[PDB]
Design a protein around this ligand. Sequence first.
Ligand SMILES: Nc1ccnc(=O)[nH]1
Ligand SMILES: Nc1ccnc(=O)[nH]1
Ligand SMILES: [Cl-]
Lengths: 259, 259
Amino acid sequence: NQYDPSLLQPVPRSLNRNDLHLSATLPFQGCDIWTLYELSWLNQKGLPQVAIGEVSIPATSANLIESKSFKLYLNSYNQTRFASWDEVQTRLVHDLSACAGETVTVNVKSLNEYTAEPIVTMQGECIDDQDIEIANYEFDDALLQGAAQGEEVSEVLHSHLLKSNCLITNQPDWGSVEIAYHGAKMNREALLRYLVSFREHNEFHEQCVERIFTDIMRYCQPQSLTVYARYTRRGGLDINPFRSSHQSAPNHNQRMARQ
Amino acid sequence: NQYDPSLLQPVPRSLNRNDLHLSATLPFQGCDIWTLYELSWLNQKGLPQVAIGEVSIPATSANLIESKSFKLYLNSYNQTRFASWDEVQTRLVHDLSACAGETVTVNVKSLNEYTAEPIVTMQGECIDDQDIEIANYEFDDALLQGAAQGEEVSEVLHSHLLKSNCLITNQPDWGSVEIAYHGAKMNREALLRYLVSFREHNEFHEQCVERIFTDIMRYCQPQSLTVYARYTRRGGLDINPFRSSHQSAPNHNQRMARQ
Ligand SMILES: Nc1ccnc(=O)[nH]1
Ligand SMILES: Nc1ccnc(=O)[nH]1
Ligand SMILES: [Cl-]
C-alpha cells in the first residue's frame, strides 16, 4: 500500500520497432501522451488528495512503461502520505523518467482546473461517413497499396473507428486517429478499410501508431506525415501516441468524447 | 461475437436493501444513471458505428444489472450488423428494461453531439479543503452520530474523495458525491470523515449511495435529503446513483473531471 517506485516495468521500444523493420535512425519523432484520471495520495495529515496527471514520454526513449505496472505503481500512492503536491509531481517525474530512460514531463492538475473545459474533436475531415461494404476485419497493410494516386494535396483526415484487441487481455481497445499529410491524395475508402482491418487484430497502442505511420510512408510516400491516435482509458489511464516527420508534439492534451 | 440479449445478469435490489434494514416501502426515490462510453456495432454494410449511450434505470426496479454482464452484453454488438441507429436503441431499451424489470430509458448519441460540451463540477460547497488528521480508513456509520447539531439550514455539500474497493476485484472505485439537505446543520468534519471511512472498505456503487442516504437520514434526520454520487468508469461504463426523498432524477448527465 505504500509508495514503491520498484513497481514500474519498462518495455524496450526496440522490440516492436525491430518488427516494423525500423533502424537505429528514426523515421519519426514525437511522444506518448498519457492521462492519469485516478491519481490519488494522502496529505501529511492522512486526508486523501485527488488530481489528474498528464504525462508526456519522448518517442525516442529507450523504453515505454508497461501499462499494468504503471497502474500498480500509481496505486501505491493511494495510501501513502506526501507533504505537498509538488513532492508528488517530483516523484512522478523522476520515476517515469528513470523507467522510460529519458526525461518525461508531468503535470499534476487539481480537478477544479478542468471546470468548463470543452470536449474537443480532431482536426481535419472525418472519413467514417462512407457507404462502403466491409470485407476484412483481419489486418492487411497492403490495403494502402495504390491508395495515393492523385494531385499533391495538404489534408488532415480522421476516423473514430480504430479498434484492436489488447495482446494481453484480448478485450477491445478503442480509439480515434488523426492523419495529417502533404503528398499525393490518399484514397479514403482504402484508408478507412486499412483502419478497420485492425478491428479483430492484436495490437499495442504505441506499436499501432508507429505501424500506421510506416505503412502510410511506405505505400503513399507523402512529403510529410503526422499520425496521432487518442485511445480511451483502461484502468484509469489513457494513451495518446503522436508520431510525426516534423512536429514533436501536438498543441494540447484535450480530451475527446469517448475518453 | 453476435448480439446476445441472454448475456445480461440481474441482481435483486432486495439483497442489499435487506442489509440496510429497508422495507417494502422505500424511503427514497431516484435512479441509476449509466454512461456507455464504448458502444459500437456494425451498419448493414459492415462498417463500424460508434456512439455514447446514456441509460437511466429506476431505483424502484426489482433488479439492477450485473456490471460484468452489462459489459459482455455490450461487447456482443461489436460484430453484429444492425440496419439503423434506432434499431440499436430499441434493442438496448428492451433488454435493459427486461433485465431490470421496469422501463429503462436509453439515449444513443453520436460523438459529434459531445463537441464543445463542458466538464461540470458538482453543486454546493466542496468540503475536502479541511485541515483535519485522518484516523480511519475502516468504515464506521456512527461517524455521523451527533453530526447534526445546529440551526436548521438548506445546504448542498460535496466531496471528490469517495473511494471504496469493488467487492469482486478489490481495486479501488473512485467517485464524487453531492449531498443536498434541509435540516440541522451537519458537521463537515464528521461528514468528511464518514466519507473517507469508505476508503478501504468493500462496497458496491448503488449499495453505497443507498447506505449514505439511510445513515444520514438515521443520524442527522433532515427534513429532506438527496444523495448523488458520480463514479469513474470501469470497462467502458460508469454508474451515477441518485437517491432522494423528493426529486426523482438530476437535471442532466454531464460528466465531471475524472469521469
Ligand atoms: N501494456 C502496454 C499497453 C500499451 N502501452 C504500453 O506502454 N504498455
Ligand atoms: N457488479 C456491479 C457493480 C456495480 N453496480 C452494478 O449494478 N453491478
Ligand atoms: Cl477500465
